Every structure is written in structure tokens, then in C-alpha cells.
């Protein structure tokens, strides 16, 4: 399901992502635009037997388990299909432990490439939340 800006930003506000470590809702919604275009069921394959899952394109190597990736560490202890739900809870929860691993939101290639060092607060400018 392709979410829509403020609908997603309202549910992420709700899920405590606001100012989680030092990242305001501008960043969380920004990543979800440039990682997936807000499509909950978005998948993308990588160069090493791994897929990225959901809104926030969590990699099946380190973070979730899909049972066909090698080097699977599954650090969020979750099936990656749990990450393809139209309700952001398991995605928010694993996002917390990704942003906690001492790297901040750098783990997200598109956040790093399209949302870092810009006016990320733009992403909810005009939004109810």
C-alpha cells in the first residue's frame, strides 16, 4: 500500500520516532520516501542473496530473516514478511535497533544520499500530525 506523507508521518509520530536518537520526523518520512516511495510491500534484491524489505528497506542479511540469505544474522529477531505489513509496528521496532547500532541513520543508503544535509523538516511542512 502506498501510504501518503502525513498519513505515514502521523503513524510514525505516534510510534515515537520523533527525535529518536537525534532524528526528527522529517528524517523518518524522508527515508521512507526515497527508500520505498511509501510502499509498504516494496522489495528490492541486492548483490549478495539479500532482499530489502518494506517501507524502510531493511536488509535480510543483518536485520531480519527470510530464510534464503547467507550471512543472516537477523538482529531484529523478526521474519522479514512481518516487515511487509500495512501497519508500521515491526518496521518501527526494527528501525529503533538499527538506528541504535552506533551509526545513526547512515545505515540507510537513500537517507544518506537524498535526505542527509538538506532541510529534512520539509517532509511534514504543511502536514497535520
Amino acid at each position: 500500500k502506498v501510504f501518503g506523507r502525513c498519513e505515514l508521518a502521523a503513524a510514525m509520530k505516534r510510534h515515537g520516532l520523533d527525535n529518536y536518537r537525534g532524528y526528527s520526523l522529517g528524517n523518518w518520512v524522508c527515508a521512507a520516501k526515497f527508500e520505498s516511495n511509501f510502499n509498504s510491500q516494496a522489495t528490492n534484491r541486492n548483490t549478495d542473496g539479500s532482499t530489502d524489505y518494506g517501507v524502510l528497506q531493511i536488509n535480510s542479511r543483518w536485520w531480519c530473516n527470510d530464510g534464503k540469505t547467507p550471512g543472516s544474522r537477523n538482529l531484529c529477531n523478526i521474519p522479514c514478511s512481518a516487515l511487509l505489513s500495512s501497519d508500521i509496528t515491526a518496521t518501527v521496532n526494527c528501525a529503533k535497533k538499527i538506528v541504535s547500532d552506533g551509526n545513526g541513520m547512515n545505515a540507510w543508503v537513500a537517507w544518506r544520499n537524498r535526505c542527509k544535509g538538506t532541510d529534512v523538516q520539509a517532509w511534514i511542512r504543511g502536514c497535520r500530525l
Partner: antibody
Amino acid sequence: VQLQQSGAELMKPGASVKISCKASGYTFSDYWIEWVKQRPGHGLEWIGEILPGSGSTNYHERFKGKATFTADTSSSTAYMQLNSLTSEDSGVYYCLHGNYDFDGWGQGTTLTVSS
Amino acid sequence: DIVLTQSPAIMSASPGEKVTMTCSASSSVNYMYWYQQKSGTSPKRWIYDTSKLASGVPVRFSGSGSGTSYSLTISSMETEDAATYYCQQWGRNPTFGGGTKLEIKR
């Protein structure tokens, strides 16, 4: 309770066709079913795949737009649709598993596109 | 993505003797997968994740390599090892290799 496919097709150029894969016996919802194409003499080409539960699909560069996947959770069937068939689409299409719990392929559907 | 070239395309061996098939990737790849296809059946996954044999590959097969060169080696060629073997880089967009045909000698 098998990875079963549809019989062989014979189709006019220009039309579309749909191959089933009645993937039965496990929690369908939970595993990716891939699809491969075999042109005898040239061998294998990977089409793409679909995770029944979520409707998520990945397609190879070459088959995006030529192929579409669907899955119907209640009959535990998965289907591939070939758009706009030409002669160079004649081959055997295989559905398969490739995870750490099983890896069975289906037997193939041959498809002849001819007038 | 990567082009996989297999050498040789047809090959022969007697029962009892040692077989090595080679597959070359145009780019570095992280893992290689081998599938075997006998005439008249759908291929079967034979070695996965570069060295792990699939359920039902007899212990006489083993595969290796890294980056550019991988290989499938049979130590005793048994008659039932005659098929085509194919390699696949199962990457962002998977490609298969041409194959190698194994005929038994007489």
C-alpha cells in the same frame, strides 16, 4: 500438495497467457516462488518472483513489463502472465522454490506461440 | 547482471574418473549456485551457497571458487552424473551460465 503447473499452451502472437503453479502443502503466505524460462539450445533465464503473502514481486531487467505475477491465497495458486506473446517466448516456464527449507521446482509448462 | 561463461560446453568421462567443470563470472560474485538437469526433467538444485550440497546430492560432488572462478568437481564419475550442469549468480538480477554437458565414455 505439490508444486504443480498448467498444461502446455499454444497461442496467437500478440495475445497474453497465464501459467498457474498450485503450490500446495506449506504456509504459502510465507515463501517466495521464483519463475525461470528455458529456451532449449540457449538454456535458462530467470524471470522474477513473488512472495504470496504480501504480493511483493521482483523481476529481472528483461522481463519487467513482459511479465506480471499474482497469487491467490485461498487456492494457494500463483500465476505468471506473459504480455504480448511473440515467437521468441516459446519455451518451458518453471516455478520453483529456493530457500533453506525446500527447493523443489515444478515440471514446466511449454508454450508455443504460433499462428 | 554478470555474464557467466562455462568451460567446456561438452565433456566426457568414464565411470570411476574425476570431473571438474569451470564457470567464470565477468564480475566478482558473492556466492555461486549449481543446478543439474537430466533430459526429460526440470533442473534440480545441486550445490547452493558456493559449497553446500543440496539435500540428495551424493557426497562425491563438491564445489568451490571465489569472485571470478568457481567449479564443480566429481571425484569418482558415476554413470548417473551425466547431465548438464549449470551455474547461476543469484544476485540482484540472476543470470545462468551456458552449461557443461557430461556424457559417459565407451
